[PDB]
From a paper:
The ring-like structural maintenance of chromosomes (SMC) complex MukBEF folds the genome of Escherichia coli and related bacteria into large loops, presumably by active DNA loop extrusion. MukBEF activity within the replication terminus macrodomain is suppressed by the sequence-specific unloader MatP. MukBEF is the SMC complex of E. coli and other enterobacteria.
This suggests that the arms can gradually “zip up,” similar to what has been proposed for Smc-ScpAB based on distance measurements by electron paramagnetic resonance (Vazquez Nunez et al., 2021). The most open class has arms unzipped up to the elbow, and the most closed one is the apo state.
Residue numbers in the entry:
A (entry chain I): 1 to 134
B (entry chain J): 1 to 135
C (entry chain E): 2 to 213
D (entry chain F): 9 to 80
E (entry chain B): 248 to 297
F (entry chain B): 1138 to 1235
Write the structure that this text describes.
Amino acid sequence: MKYQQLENLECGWKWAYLIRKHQEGEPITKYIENSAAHAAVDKLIKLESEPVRVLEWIEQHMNPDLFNRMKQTIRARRKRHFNAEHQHTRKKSIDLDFPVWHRLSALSQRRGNTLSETIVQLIEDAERKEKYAN
Amino acid sequence: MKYQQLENLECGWKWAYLIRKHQEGEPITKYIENSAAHAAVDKLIKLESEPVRVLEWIEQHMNPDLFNRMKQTIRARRKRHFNAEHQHTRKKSIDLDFPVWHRLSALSQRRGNTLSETIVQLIEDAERKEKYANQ
Amino acid sequence: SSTHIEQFMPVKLAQALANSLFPELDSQLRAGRHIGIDDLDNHAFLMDFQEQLEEFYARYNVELIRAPEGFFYLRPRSTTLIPRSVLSELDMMVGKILCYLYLSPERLANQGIFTSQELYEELISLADEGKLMKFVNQRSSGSDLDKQKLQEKVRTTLNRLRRLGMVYFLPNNNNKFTITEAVFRFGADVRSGDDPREIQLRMIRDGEAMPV
Amino acid sequence: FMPVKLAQALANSLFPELDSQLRAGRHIGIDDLDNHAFLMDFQEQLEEFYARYNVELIRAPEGFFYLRPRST
Amino acid sequence: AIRVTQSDRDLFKHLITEATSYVSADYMRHANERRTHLDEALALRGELFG
Amino acid sequence: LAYMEGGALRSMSDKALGALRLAVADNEHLRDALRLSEDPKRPERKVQFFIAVYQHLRERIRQDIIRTDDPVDAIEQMEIELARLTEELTAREQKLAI
DNA sequence: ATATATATATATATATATATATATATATAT
DNA sequence: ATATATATATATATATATATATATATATAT
DNA sequence: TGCCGTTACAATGTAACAGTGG
DNA sequence: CCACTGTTACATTGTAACGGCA
């Protein structure tokens, strides 16, 4: 356990995620009958502003197949929330043309390094080549 | 014009964009009164299966703020949709740590080329070393 | 959201249950009345919201069933919340005979309008007169008093079937009637070309027909 | 459409048995705690539902509920 | 009966014609570009080998 | 269509989709399939939707005599029935007038 | 053979919504 | 300074839908 | 194993820059 | 000039797959 978990924050995250999924059409609840599903969704909607009861709501009506996805989404949300405080711990997202990405991933898989490590090593070698020439 | 403009597709894109924006809570309408805004949104909802009238709904009730974001988003969506046909024209999204990205962006701004071009030059120097080693 | 029909009931089922025709149809159905093509309004109502009503009535442990002929009715289960009852053997005789008349071309001139006398004549023609009479009275041997008793019993069974929708009395005449397709149920034991003793077990298993 | 609270009362899992017993003429008193409470809560709508049948849902002064059929 | 049957016939006709129009066009496109890309690829392969 | 180029094919597909949008609004799952068919990365989806359309019109057949489940085949039987009904309508209106 | 229960139809009175015609005060043309 | 047109309110009475009570036919059961 | 960090993506939305033609 | 388009460089959120550790 590296990042401390805060209930009033992660519960709001879970509520927002479930509301988003419901608005997206995902079946939040395990009830195939539409009446029970709608009733549970209404309970959730009126359940806003409550961690201790949204957790119970999840335990009681949550769709079995979404547990893993919700858990990993909350994991990622927690990690990003804690890393977004400092500049050096943040992550920069870019888009690479498919050939360039293909070659870079080929190198990374070949050497066992990650994309960041592979690019760092390559840049260091480029600098070393510059110094060699210079 | 490099990408063919299709009316019945861009209209659907625009309608979906408006609906998504509204359900996110933003004021797509130009009306400050609640009743007129609600009526305009309801009419837009009715316009789901008629993308052609969506242009007119835009000209009548779309918030003046959104022209730039609208024209940006649909343009980008068109580019991506036409590039997605072939792999060699697709784009790949990757995430980089701040130190690594800082160094890479500084190098690219030094060489005056895009990130992909800088990576191409770098990987090409590495592959030149590998090639010379192989011969 | 709350105060929203979908919370408790599907929209179409609620619309069906709020229609002006629902109460008469429900009372008749629970009474045991079969629905044929003749009751155009009620038949169309059942057709439009057929699925909602089967699932609603399932809550009573009774199946709203549409036979292939196109007539709806209710079949209670062993765990029925609505009581259940079985027709008399004489009722079976008259129903089988009624199905015959529906399918019989000799009486085509009648154009579907039949009198109880003709029904009794056909019944005695196809059945065993005295051995059928045995059920009317255990001590019958062809006495005309018992003959009139059997005629009266046939008339009474015909009236009960009228209550069940298998037969309609004419808008002004209670001595003449018109048959309905519901009578086809009396042939469910022979609609399938198999051994009678296996079809009877299949039906009784399905709850279609109990024995006596 | 239909009244919302009427839909809630009809949908309740107690409704089938209670409806069968009412249509059978049974009188629901204070002894039947669940049924009596249900009728107390949802009387305002079951009266209309059973008036659609030209029947009256009557709560006696003693408290027990029953169905009184009209001429129609 | 006439109204219902005419509506059904019109709906069937319109649906079928529009679905065929929507699908066959892109199908023929993909076929044509597949042929063209194969033709393009052969020359590259031949040059590469030598 | 083999002669034409990609642009015309794309344009006519767009027009066909425009017609479909009106022709499909009533249905829910067929409309959803039509919407999903729009992804360019999975052209096969298109064909699937086409199947659904057939898989729809198959169930819209009314009675046994029109069970030429090939939808394009039922058109001729239905046109025959419309013509027939026209003659009966003429006879019936004459009867009503008299 | 006849008492009794049941379904149907008609007449009758209640209660409510609504269109019609008149009375009264004000506005505006003569 | 006047009389006609308008808007308002009101009672009239017209019609519908409801609910009740009585007569009838007649099908059951002792 | 199940949780928990971590990576490598995918999909969509935006701001900013560079081109192009009217 | 001005508008509209193409492109790059991000952000934002979600997900599946590894691998560490109780």
